[PDB]
């Protein structure tokens, strides 16, 4: 017998491979597994774990967020790295000349990057031209902007969005939401 101090046979709870069956994603995973195993550069381990992430854990990165990342002091010449899709933003007034490494580019994002003389490259090309991730800047998208996140943790006085199918005066604005109808939580 053992007086166990912790729960037995616990899986780590972190994803160790992509759930995706895409062969080319698995080729990228192979490359960065070698890189993380043989280089002790933290960038490669970060890139390795990022390739495993699910779709909601890889929010799209807009070119406007990229350009704001490029306006950091000393970051104008960095290689912007997105493990995910780079989308276009028509609210952007101007976009600079930059090198962006991403899994995917939407058509507008790629056109905008190339028109300003930039380079829209894949992650294997990035690995070839920066095997340690030299002069890179990792940009991540907004995880909590998802519509599903509005409804997480709903409860009295929590100020969250109710799960509801129609919006209007007759849909959940009465008793419990109004002091004139009893109480307001």
């Amino acid at each position: 017998g053992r007086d166990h101090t912790s729960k037995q046979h616990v899986r780590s709870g972190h994803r160790t491979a992509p759930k995706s069956d895409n062969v080319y994603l698995q080729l990228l995973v192979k490359l960065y597994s070698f890189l993380a195993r043989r280089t002790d550069a933290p960038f490669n381990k970060v890139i390795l774990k990022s390739l495993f992430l699910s779709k909601i854990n890889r929010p799209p990165v807009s070119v406007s967020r990229i350009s704001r990342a490029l306006k950091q002091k000393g970051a104008a010449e960095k290689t912007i790295v997105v493990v995910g899709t780079v989308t276009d933003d028509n609210r952007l007034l101007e976009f600079p000349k930059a090198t962006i490494a991403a899994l995917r580019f939407t058509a507008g994002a790629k056109d905008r990057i190339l028109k300003n003389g930039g380079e829209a490259i894949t992650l294997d090309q990035l690995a070839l031209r920066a095997p340690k991730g030299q002069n890179t800047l990792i940009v991540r998208g907004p995880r909590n902007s998802r519509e599903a996140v509005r409804h997480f943790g709903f409860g009295p006085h929590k100020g969250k969005a109710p799960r509801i199918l129609s919006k209007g005066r007759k849909f959940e604005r009465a008793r419990g939401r109004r002091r004139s109808r009893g109480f307001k939580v």
Binding site: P162, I164, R169, F171, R173, G176, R178, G182
Partner: protein, 148 residues
């Protein structure tokens, strides 16, 4: 497909995952939204506040077309300019020749004031406009023209 369901895995186990004590029965607790004020109050008052009662005035024979007025913000306004001539218009527009943007013809009813415009004069045609939206258009040398 049926071969992936837990019904296949529950074969050979007596209760099919429904318990021996509870004994999955027909409608314990009622049907539908039964008892929302009595034995399901603890659910409705927590997750659906506002459910019971009346608020506001009735509107007999509401016609939704009366209220059609899609909004467009200033930061998206230049997407309505012809894409082949957008770059030319930015460099060449002035008080004598400014692009005309027909927001109503593109499916919009009111121009709102979120964001920043290019420092380029524009003639904006709209049914309605917000106060701040017109000020920002007039500040880049443009004008708002009311249409119907």
């Amino acid at each position: 497909p049926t071969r992936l369901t837990k019904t296949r895995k529950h074969r050979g186990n007596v209760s099919a995952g429904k318990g021996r004590i509870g004994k999955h029965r027909k409608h314990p607790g009622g049907r539908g939204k039964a008892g929302g004020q009595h034995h399901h109050r603890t659910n409705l008052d927590k997750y659906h506040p506002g459910y019971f009662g009346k608020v506001g005035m009735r509107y007999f024979h509401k016609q939704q077309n009366h209220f059609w007025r899609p909004e467009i913000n200033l930061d998206k306004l230049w997407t309505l300019v012809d894409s082949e001539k957008k770059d030319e218009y930015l460099s060449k527009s002035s008080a004598s020749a400014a692009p005309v943007i027909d927001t109503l013809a593109h499916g919009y009813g009111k121009v709102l004031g979120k964001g920043r415009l290019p420092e380029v004069p524009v003639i904006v045609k709209a049914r309605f406009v917000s106060k701040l939206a017109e000020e920002k258009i007039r500040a880049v040398g443009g004008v708002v023209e009311l249409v119907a």
